[PDB]
């Protein structure tokens, strides 16, 4: 009977609906503090980049909760956050399963593919724009010089150690880091053919050395990534011609 | 040899203008 509603026993249920709405917010701030690489050293860089877009969503929550005075009653605030109530319930339990790194990057692209939502689509589009920033950074250094950059990442590392005595393919063993399943996922082109050819043009760039839709913007990055691999492939055809 | 490589980097310069046009289309959306 403590307060419960000046209107009899109504706040006893309405305040639980917004405390449960308040319950999901302290999970997102709990998740953001535990994955930072100043308090942990076992999470991936793509796992860190998903949080970097999440923390920009946290200050939008903080700027909106600071503007709710002066409140009239408990309906005027919960109905303002009724649209925001659907969003926070989505935005917390997508990661809570436990996907990590490229699989977490695979969970978020599917969730950005789930339109018929029009306020949940651009925030996950923005999370796809931020979480793909370390992965796309590892793309252009690999196709223009061939340097592998991450010391600790979700993407598996191969050494590509070449014997000096045998010239076999300048590498003498590579295998694959995704050895047989080859499941490069969820980035532009969908990483089903061009992932096999950013492989081989990445093999040959260092052979030069030492002698409205989430799919449409995906398709806009796709053909430039088809254009530059064919541009690096037409250099190694000329390098085979001259040597 | 160098004349064939001059047209290859010229196509990369056209791709760089296409990447700036795609960034302007992302700013308009």
């Amino acid at each position: 009977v403590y307060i419960s509603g000046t209107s009899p026993d109504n706040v006893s249920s309405l305040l639980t609906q917004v405390a449960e709405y308040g319950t999901y917010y302290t999970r997102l701030s709990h998740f953001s503090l535990l994955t930072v690489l100043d308090s942990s050293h076992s999470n991936g860089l793509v796992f860190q980049a998903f949080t970097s877009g999440l923390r920009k969503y946290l200050q939008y929550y903080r700027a909106c909760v600071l503007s709710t005075p002066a409140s009239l009653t408990l309906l005027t605030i919960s109905f303002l956050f009724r649209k925001l109530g659907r969003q926070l319930r989505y935005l917390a339990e997508l990661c809570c399963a436990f996907p990590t790194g490229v699989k977490l990057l695979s969970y978020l692209y599917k969730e950005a593919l789930e339109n018929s939502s029009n306020e949940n689509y651009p925030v996950l589009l923005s999370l796809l724009k931020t979480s793909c920033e370390p992965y796309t950074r590892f793309i252009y250094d690999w196709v223009y010089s061939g340097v592998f950059r991450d010391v600790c990442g979700e993407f598996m590392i191969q050494v590509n150690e070449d014997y000096l005595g045998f010239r076999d393919k300048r590498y003498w063993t590579h295998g694959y880091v995704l050895i047989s399943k080859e499941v490069e996922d969820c980035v532009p082109v969908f990483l089903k053919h061009v992932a096999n050819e950013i492989y081989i043009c990445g093999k040959t760039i260092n052979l030069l050395k030492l002698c409205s839709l989430p799919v449409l913007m995906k398709y806009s990055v796709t053909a430039p990534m088809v254009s530059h691999v064919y541009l690096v492939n037409k250099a190694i055809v000329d390098y085979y011609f001259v040597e | 040899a160098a004349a064939a490589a001059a047209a290859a980097a010229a196509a990369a310069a056209a791709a760089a203008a296409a990447a700036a046009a795609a960034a302007a289309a992302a700013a308009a959306a």
Binding site: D38, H41, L45, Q48, A49, Q59, P134, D150, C152 | -
Partner: protein
Amino acid sequence: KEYMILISQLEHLQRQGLLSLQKLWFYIQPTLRTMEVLASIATSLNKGECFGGATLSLLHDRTFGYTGDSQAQELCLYLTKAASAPYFDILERWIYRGIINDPYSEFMVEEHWDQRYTIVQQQIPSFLQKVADK
């Protein structure tokens, strides 16, 4: 010094009553992530007591470990090049004049017939090993 400017503006907002415990807590949010990354750098320089260019190897792994939050790797990019600012002024005397000026092991050097190798790697510049021989 710049951190004290934002507090003096917060005190300039304290000229009348407009603030609560929640209000300044929203204002401390951009400086919280800035202070916590300067904290992890400063405690990592204190434990091992790295000196010189292995220092620059340590800050570069701290930059590599940061990768993501591109607005705030921009700050520690400015931190590591201010640390490399005397490390580069000593290098141009060694690479464009041939005579070195090291106060206290500030660059890697051996003192200068079949004299010796003068091979030296006491600082370890953070990049790959081909530059330190060249």
